[PDB]
Amino acid sequence: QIEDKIEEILSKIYHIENEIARIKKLIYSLSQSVADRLGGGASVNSDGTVNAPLYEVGTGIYNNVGSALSALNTSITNTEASVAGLAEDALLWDESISAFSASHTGNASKITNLAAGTLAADSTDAVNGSQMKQIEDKIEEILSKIYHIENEIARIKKLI
Amino acid sequence: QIEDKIEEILSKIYHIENEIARIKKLIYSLSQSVADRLGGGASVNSDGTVNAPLYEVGTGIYNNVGSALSALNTSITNTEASVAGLAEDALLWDESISAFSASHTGNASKITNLAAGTLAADSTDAVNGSQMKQIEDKIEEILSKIYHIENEIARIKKLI
Amino acid sequence: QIEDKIEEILSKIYHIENEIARIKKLIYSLSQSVADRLGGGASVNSDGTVNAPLYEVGTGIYNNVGSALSALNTSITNTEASVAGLAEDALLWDESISAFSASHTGNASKITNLAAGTLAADSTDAVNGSQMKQIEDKIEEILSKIYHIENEIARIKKLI
Numbered sequence: 001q002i003e004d005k006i007e008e009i010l011s012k013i014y015h016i017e018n019e020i021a022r023i024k025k026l027i028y029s030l031s032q033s034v035a036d037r038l039g040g041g042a043s044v045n046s047d048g049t050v051n052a053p054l055y056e057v058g059t060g061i062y063n064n065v066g067s068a069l070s071a072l073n074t075s076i077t078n079t080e081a082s083v084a085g086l087a088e089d090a091l092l093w094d095e096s097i098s099a100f101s102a103s104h105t106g107n108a109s110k111i112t113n114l115a116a117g118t119l120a121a122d123s124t125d126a127v128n129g130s131q132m133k134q135i136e137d138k139i140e141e142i143l144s145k146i147y148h149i150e151n152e153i154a155r156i157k158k159l160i
Numbered sequence: 161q162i163e164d165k166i167e168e169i170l171s172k173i174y175h176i177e178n179e180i181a182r183i184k185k186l187i188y189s190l191s192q193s194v195a196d197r198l199g200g201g202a203s204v205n206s207d208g209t210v211n212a213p214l215y216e217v218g219t220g221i222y223n224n225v226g227s228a229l230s231a232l233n234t235s236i237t238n239t240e241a242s243v244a245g246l247a248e249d250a251l252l253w254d255e256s257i258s259a260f261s262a263s264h265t266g267n268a269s270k271i272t273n274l275a276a277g278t279l280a281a282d283s284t285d286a287v288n289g290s291q292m293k294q295i296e297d298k299i300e301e302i303l304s305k306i307y308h309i310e311n312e313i314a315r316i317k318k319l320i
Numbered sequence: 321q322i323e324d325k326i327e328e329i330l331s332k333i334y335h336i337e338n339e340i341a342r343i344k345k346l347i348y349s350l351s352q353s354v355a356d357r358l359g360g361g362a363s364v365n366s367d368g369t370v371n372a373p374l375y376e377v378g379t380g381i382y383n384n385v386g387s388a389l390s391a392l393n394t395s396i397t398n399t400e401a402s403v404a405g406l407a408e409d410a411l412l413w414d415e416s417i418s419a420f421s422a423s424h425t426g427n428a429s430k431i432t433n434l435a436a437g438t439l440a441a442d443s444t445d446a447v448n449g450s451q452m453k454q455i456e457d458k459i460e461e462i463l464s465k466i467y468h469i470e471n472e473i474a475r476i477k478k479l480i
Contacts, residue, residue, distance in 0.1 A: 006326075006329075016177070030190070091260050108433045127447060129447055133440055192369075284435070
């Protein structure tokens with residue numbers, strides 16, 4: 001049973017060598033598939049490791065998934081900060097009062113840098129201070145003409 | 161020392177077979193753990209590779225991490241573009257002047273499609289062109305009555 | 321050829337043991353590289369598996385890439401929802417009419433909580449209902465003075 005024992009040792013060694021060649025190929029296949037699922041140019045190195053992906057987020061490049069996710073989180077944070085800024089400063093429709101509200105930090109506020117509205121019976125343009133001042137000037141002139149009328153009348157009222 | 165040498169060859173072969181069965185199981189365990197850390201339904205294929213994850217971002221499905229990160233970057237980009245649009249077009253509080261500003265691209269601008277404000281001593285409603293026109297009409301009528309008064313007065317002024 | 325056959329069996333076994341030690345080290349190197357490319361503190365466990373990353377997105381922690389991507393998708397969704405809210409409610413520049421528009425859901429709308437505008441010949445401040453009411457009161461007083469003038473005139477008109 002000695003030459004027989006050698007015969008089978010050589011055959012079992014042959015099966016082991018086949019397993020090793022199959023295992024070596026399983027490892028690079030695994031490695032390749034992982035590189036594929038990472039994307040961003042991840043590839044398999046000559047030594048069997050997965051070379052780093054290159055992920056572009058914003059103006060930066062990230063060599064791992066966590067750093068990219070973090071960068072996306074920060075971008076969304078910054079965009080939310082801009083949105084909250086707009087929301088604090090925008091002249092907004094207020095549903096509770098059915099109107100746009102020029103309230104700011106609890107106070108009625110001005111609107112300024114407003115160009116003059118068309119004055120017509122069907123104009124829906126807002127009007128400004130310059131336009132109302134011209135009306136106020138007309139009114140003051142009307143009152144002076146009236147005071148002149150009251151005096152001219154008074155003179156003839158006594159002179160009779 | 162010949163049968164002894166066989167005895168140990170069979171024992172060393174037995175240790176190698178145990179190592180191979182342990183290595184085969186290490187590879188599928190590694191593979192499984194990688195599938196778990198990727199998520200998105202990644203699983204281990206019969207051949208030992210990691211099947212692709214399916215990541216939903218927006219209206220698309222992405223089969224690798226890089227393509228998903230890219231898609232998230234583009235969504236945030238698009239949302240920032242909407243925000244910048246709002247910021248260019250919104251009627252905004254200007255802290256430097258303590259007031260909302262109807263400035264647009266450096267010019268005083270109109271506000272139009274404005275419904276008529278309540279006219280009362282405590283109204284904080286904006287007023288429109290139609291409302292100011294009605295005032296201007298009243299003023300023109302007042303001036304004609306005054307001119308009629310000046311003439312009636314003049315007639316009696318000479319006729320004495 | 322029997323002792324020779326043993327000589328080479330021991331040498332082929334020696335090459336196989338070297339391959340196994342090289343393969344064991346390839347697996348932990350692969351594992352390490354995958355842990356590195358995942359980031360978020362992913363590390364290699366004693367058993368050769370990749371321990372889970374810890375990815376922070378918003379106020380949550382996610383133990384796999386898919387769940388993190390999902391969380392980033394939901395955050396961007398929520399930020400877009402805020403932006404669309406602003407866009408529906410903001411008083412906006414309308415390029416088609418070259419003016420800010422106080423239109424809301426197809427209707428001319430009020431602006432209220434507006435503080436009084438400066439009345440001067442170069443004021444670009446919007447004016448409110450309280451300011452226009454004071455003008456209307458002045459006008460009513462002017463008309464009563466005129467009616468008094470018409471009566472005083474009429475009396476002297478007949479009395480001659």
